[PDB]
Amino acid sequence: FNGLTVLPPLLTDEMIAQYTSALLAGTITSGWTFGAGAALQIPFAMQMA
Amino acid sequence: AYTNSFTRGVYYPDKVFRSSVLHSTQDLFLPFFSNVTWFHANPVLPFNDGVYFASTEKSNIIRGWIFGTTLDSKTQSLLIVNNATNVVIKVCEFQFCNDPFLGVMESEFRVYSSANNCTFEYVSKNLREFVFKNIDGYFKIYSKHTPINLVRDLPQGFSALEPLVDLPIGINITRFQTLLALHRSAYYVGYLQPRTFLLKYNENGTITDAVDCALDPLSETKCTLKSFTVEKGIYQTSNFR
Amino acid sequence: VQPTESIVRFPNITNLCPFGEVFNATRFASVYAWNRKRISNCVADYSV
Amino acid sequence: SFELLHAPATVCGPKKSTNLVKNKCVNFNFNGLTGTGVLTESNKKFLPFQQFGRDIADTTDAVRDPQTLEILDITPCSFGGVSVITPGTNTSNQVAVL
Amino acid sequence: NQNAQALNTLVKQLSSNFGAISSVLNDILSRLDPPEAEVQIDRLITGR
Ligand SMILES: *[C@@H]1O[C@H](CO)[C@@H](O)[C@H](O)[C@H]1NC(C)=O
Ligand SMILES: *[C@@H]1O[C@H](CO)[C@@H](O)[C@H](O)[C@H]1NC(C)=O
Ligand SMILES: *[C@@H]1O[C@H](CO)[C@@H](O)[C@H](O)[C@H]1NC(C)=O
């Protein structure tokens, strides 16, 4: 256009998708333990319990 | 008698191309669902700012138009005829008779008798339609031809009109007439006015549809949103003063 | 980037305002009765 | 004997055209419209009464040259900001430019 | 939709004379000398 510029976002879409996938994997595997420090694995049934 | 001009009388307002934008234009157009005349085949009619004109027959009985202010001598006038294929345009004085026409007996004469100081010359079922607009010294002509099957009935359809010619004069025109070809022993007239329209173009700069804003509340609702489709809801359009 | 130069393009040259029949006419007129031929829509070449 | 009548002007001299140039940054002018940009052929279709194209945002984007009757498209010449990447003068004086 | 509409309105605001003779920096300049074209340029600048 006439002087209008659209900057590209710093985080590209696949990078955000990778963040979301990592969050899903952590939630499924370690429950809420990975949100406070090192991820601690636990069976999913016991996490739901 | 009378008939109703359904959705006809739309012309390209300029030489501009658009791909898919719905462009809103403020110009002179024939209002949608307007009242027009039912001439049979004829008298003289006024020439306020704009006029519409449509003809429909399988036999070429309609030929040319006569324009001017007084339609006599001493006043400049415009003349268009077509004998068989030679389109002739003259912008100059003439002396028209009380019954100007051209028969197809089989004689073909008796339109006028005058020629002096003439400022321009040029030599070149179905539906025919023309729009005549005289502004700021120029004379605009638009045309379109669409095959049909109705005998002498105005059809139901939409078609844009493309500019044909333009000539500079700078004169004032008030009245006009028409010629015919019956024997020697079927046209419409519409009136233009300032309105507001939005047009549709489909990737080829062709007008495929239009909506008259001042017709009904739905039309002005579409005009405000600038779209041919409206979703459920309530919209503010104008004020009651 | 800066434009290299300016370019102008216009349509072809139409009817040429036939001055050739006014400057090379076979016989002009006497001064008390002079012609008044007028020109109209066309392109006039005053350079020539 | 010339004159200026209230009627529109009809007779006057020939406009001097020049050669068109493609794929460069120039200052075009066709029959009054004027600007700058890059001239290139466009795969579009016009109508015999249609001079130039205008897209969304009401910008002149396509024009047909009145010599070959073929459609050309116009795009603005390259414009953009300049950014400087530096590690800090306290560390080094090398500079990267974007 | 809001961002696109605001940007489009900003673009459309360019084609407004703001009470001046024209809305183009060239035609105003090309037909009037600086002493009185400066007022029109100022009006365009203020509006934009
Ligand atoms: C057109 O106007 C005439 C009178 O001027 C009227 O008799 C006729 O009904 C009108 N036609 C329509 C379709 O309203
Ligand atoms: C519009 O153009 C396309 C190609 O650009 C073509 O396929 C289509 O038939 C055209 N529509 C018409 C001519 O009505
Ligand atoms: C900044 O400068 C100070 C003194 O010149 C120096 O001690 C320090 O290490 C520098 N730090 C960096 C990050 O350059």
Curated annotation (Swiss-Prot), chain B:
Disulphide bond pairs: C92-C118, C213-C223
Recorded consequence of changing Q26H: In strain: Omicron/EG.5.1
Domain BetaCoV S1-NTD: 1-225
Record annotation: effect of changing G103D: In strain: Kappa/B.1.617.1, Omicron/BA.2, Omicron/BA.2.12.1, Omicron/BA.2.75, Omicron/BA.4, Omicron/BA.5, Omicron/BQ.1.1, Omicron/XBB.1.5, Omicron/EG.5.1
Chain spans, region Disordered: 103-116
Renumbered residue ranges of the record's region Putative superantigen: 202-223
Residues carrying a glycan: N35, N83, N117, N172, N204
Result when mutating D99Y: In strain: Gamma/P.1
Domain of life: Viruses
Role noted for this protein: Attaches the virion to the cell membrane by interacting with host receptor, initiating the infection. The major receptor is host ACE2. When S2/S2' has been cleaved, binding to the receptor triggers direct fusion at the cell membrane. When S2/S2' has not been cleaved, binding to the receptor results in internalization of the virus by endocytosis using host TFRC and GRM2 and leading to fusion of the virion membrane with the host endosomal membrane. Alternatively, may use NRP1/NRP2 and integrin as entry receptors.
Quaternary structure and interacting proteins, as annotated: Binds to host ACE2. RBD also interacts with the N-linked glycan on 'Asn-90' of ACE2. Cleavage of S generates a polybasic C-terminal sequence on S1 that binds to host Neuropilin-1 (NRP1) and Neuropilin-2 (NRP2) receptors. Interacts with host integrin alpha-5/beta-1 (ITGA5:ITGB1) and with ACE2 in complex with integrin alpha-5/beta-1 (ITGA5:ITGB1). May interact via cytoplasmic c-terminus with M protein. May interact (via N-terminus) with host bilirubin and biliverdin, thereby preventing antibody binding to the SARS-CoV-2 spike NTD via an allosteric mechanism.
Protein name: Spike protein S1
Organism expressing this protein natively: Severe acute respiratory syndrome coronavirus 2 (2019-nCoV)
Full-sequence range covered: 27 to 319 of 1273
Swiss-Prot record, chain E:
Domain of life of the organism encoding this protein: Viruses
Phenotype upon changing N17K: In strain: Omicron/BA.1, Omicron/BA.2, Omicron/BA.2.12.1, Omicron/BA.2.75, Omicron/BA.4, Omicron/BA.5, Omicron/BQ.1.1, Omicron/XBB.1.5, Omicron/EG.5.1
Any coiled-coil regions, as ranges: 1-41
Function per UniProt: Subunit of the fusion protein that is processed upon entry into the host cell. Mediates fusion of the virion and cellular membranes by functioning as a class I viral fusion protein. Contains a viral fusion peptide that is unmasked after S2 cleavage. This cleavage can occur at the cell membrane by host TMPRSS2 or during endocytosis by host CSTL. In either case, this triggers an extensive and irreversible conformational change that leads to fusion of the viral envelope with the cellular cytoplasmic membrane, releasing viral genomic RNA into the host cell cytoplasm.
Protein name: Spike protein S2'
Gene assigned in the entry: S
Residues of the full protein shown: 953 to 1000 of 1273
